[model samples]
Target: RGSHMMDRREIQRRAKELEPWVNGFEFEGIRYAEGSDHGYLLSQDPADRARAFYEAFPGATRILELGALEGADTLALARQPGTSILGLEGREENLRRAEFVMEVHGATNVELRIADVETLDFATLGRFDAVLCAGLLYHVREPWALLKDAARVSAGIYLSTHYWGSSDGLETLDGYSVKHVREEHPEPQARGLSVDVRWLDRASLFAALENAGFVEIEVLHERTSAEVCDIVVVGRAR
Candidate 1:
């Protein structure tokens, strides 16, 4: 509240008040939680996910970003010329931190809202030129439903999420092979709201995308391993 009257030390003190910050950011020469593994910050340049989004929708002006998570990606996407971004985060504290960072950075092109993506209605949410669903699909209990909703919400979508690579541990859900996992909420302000989430196998993920109406899908990046199989894809709902 006293941000305008607060000095640099006061601002720094207030910033660190929120412990276990999922993402890092630097404000006025002071770095907050830079030692954490997810070192991307609001002040730093945008990462690959945002870059891929721009590449896929170069003329995108209105963007719907899912799981904004401290506004790191939100600020990145807001940098585009003529872009107005609407970033949705589930956690209130996360959105609060994002708002603080946006105010500090004087970012007015983006709007941060606290909304449940799992229950989001595309009909009332209006439409956007593109949707950014990064680090979010794996967090949902019904990934295919969200994908289907994203298809209806926008023609273009940038999805970056993890997929189960193992066949032995797979279970069937809504006719798709997936691994159901219980998410840990050690930090309430971070991660998804769903206690249990489903991760589709690599094959089922593509099929889910296809069934959701994304006809043109391009794999931009893939990092495969036994434990974690992550992929970034740009798709068009044709």
Candidate 2:
């Protein structure tokens, strides 16, 4: 009655019906699709980022994930021993695909929810051992508020975002200079919910985390470019 009983042919047929998948999946012995087709989050080594958080917090068994687009990282996190994930995704269509993948994998430790991160009240969800905020901060218009909200619920945070390199931002908000960028929104999972988003500069990014009470900050990875800089950092609330 479940995916375990389904044959390879049936599984392939169902996955094909879903069409235009933004991410690929492989469970048991089946390979579904390639992630590069969409030029989005590459499906390869999806667990790499998830493992980084576990390294930062060896005892982080409870995690709250923001912008879990298709549960790729959610599934990976849940695979770790003694871990339970509460994944929040903004779009329903994306959640549908995520739910299907989770179901196919028989993942029980992950709970997927639909909610916009920009307005989500993190306190209502209670505290967590850690928070995963990858590829989400730059998508919101008010990233500082979201970071502040995140601090109220979790002590440790794993954040990966694109930031502006120069301080000459288009405007200043919340005492931080930010550049406004437009989302193409070509598809359901392609862009942010907001048509326009604000990108914080490298300095402001660190300051925002500090202003939100994150005293300990460590850079895990960074890639610098003229237009934008990508950074993966771990922040600890004090």
Candidate 3:
């Protein structure tokens, strides 16, 4: 019975139902070993950071958001006046919740589209002044390709992802597993996929961005500790 408990469809449905109340929407019990200690790491503050990044690009009238799960960051970006924003998400349930939030907040400048990042054609969607890619690269198989697509869609880009730094000699729990290596902590449990945690060190990450045609890059924010498996890397695209 446990093996047959829920099919993929059923599991996805339940996951969607639980997503709105998760880290991206509301913070309950999630923990962030690095950065601020206020609450969940991927909570609202990241969205605020995205908003600030958008503001820095004065000429960014059009914006595209990749992996815009549940519209938390998307709504934050939409808060900017006179900016047209389009959010691309692959999950139907995420899009549903995002639409609900957008409507409730009366966000007139934001639109959500359902599309897979790997196969998306940004050229068909037109161009944008800025693009936001957050919390997604580590999970994908080809992160460099993802960066290239993000760069193709906008002149300026805001990206944040996990990085591997020196292990400060502390162990942390990822789901039920204990990890001492800073780069080996598994991906988030809710994904339900194989816990394949991919991490790019600072030098490797910078090289990847440069190879993807991003120049003049700078590390805007980062948090690394011995207790966590990954650190946050935020920066701009040339």
Candidate 4:
């Protein structure tokens, strides 16, 4: 949340240095280079909603953020005082972009690494007071895995993911009811492979969270307002 102000010339130079960004951002009245798909991020102001998580757990000091993307969530989380954030990204380019923004902002409290959250070991990484799993659930090969994992690693979790509505209401993770839907990667070479995305039914999403040992949970984003099915929820692991 505190980075030394680079003069206009310096911001320009650094902007040029980190040129060809896929995510253009404006901060402190300085607009950086251009990029693609702001993804409702700047408009949603997710950070403002996120501050409530800290308020819910005032003793929280550590956070593990999955799918850092271009670091918008990172910047938002950093604005709160006395917190150290660890962000993990799957793509190399995304990681680079995230690192640069943190550097530019002098976010010494943030540490980022390249990791596929689907296979990460939360317990070995030690404990965090809270875990941020925004915008990464449907992207996983197995949604159950993360929920179960997050329960083991942290006392609380912040999650946002999609759910399926137009169902016969008879789908099971093991029954193959959830079909393998594929989409072309914006950057196929950078992302490597085309992974199948799975959306959970409303009941299943809540069931999974509760089954994973999260005893206390709340919905921050609407559960059925996306015209499809999308939800933002926070939980405390029992």
Q: Which of the numbered candidates is closest to the native, going by highest TM-score?
A: 2
RMSD of 3: 10.7
- Which 10 successive residues of model 3 have the least lDDT summed? 174-183
User: Which wins on TM-score, candidate 2 or candidate 4?
Assistant: 2
Error of 1 at 43 (Å): 13
Q: Which 10-residue window of candidate 1 scores lowest in summed lDDT?
A: 35-44
Residues 51-74 of candidate 2 have per-residue lDDT tens digits of: 787899889988999888778889
TM-score of 1: 0.88
Which residue runs of candidate 1 sit more than 4 Å off their true CA positions? 1-10, 35-47, 185-189
Tell how far residue 66 is off in model 2, in angstroms. 0.7
- Better candidate by TM-score, 2 or 3: 2
What overall lDDT goes with each candidate model?
0.80, 0.82, 0.61, 0.71
Write model 3 residue lDDT over 1-238, tens digit each, in one string: 3462334444345445645334433222322112223225454575667656755676777888887766778888778788889998876766776776676467889999988776777678888887787767665545667777877776567777766564333233321111222223232321311234344555566777776777757566667764233433334565
User: Mind sharing the TM-score for model 4?
Assistant: 0.83
Model 3: pairs clashing at backbone N, Cα or C within 3 Å:
168-226
Point to the candidate with the largest lDDT. Answer: 2
RMSD of each: 3.3, 2.3, 10.7, 3.5
Q: Of the candidates numbered 3 and 4, which has the greater TM-score value?
A: 4
All candidates in order of lDDT, best leading: 2, 1, 4, 3
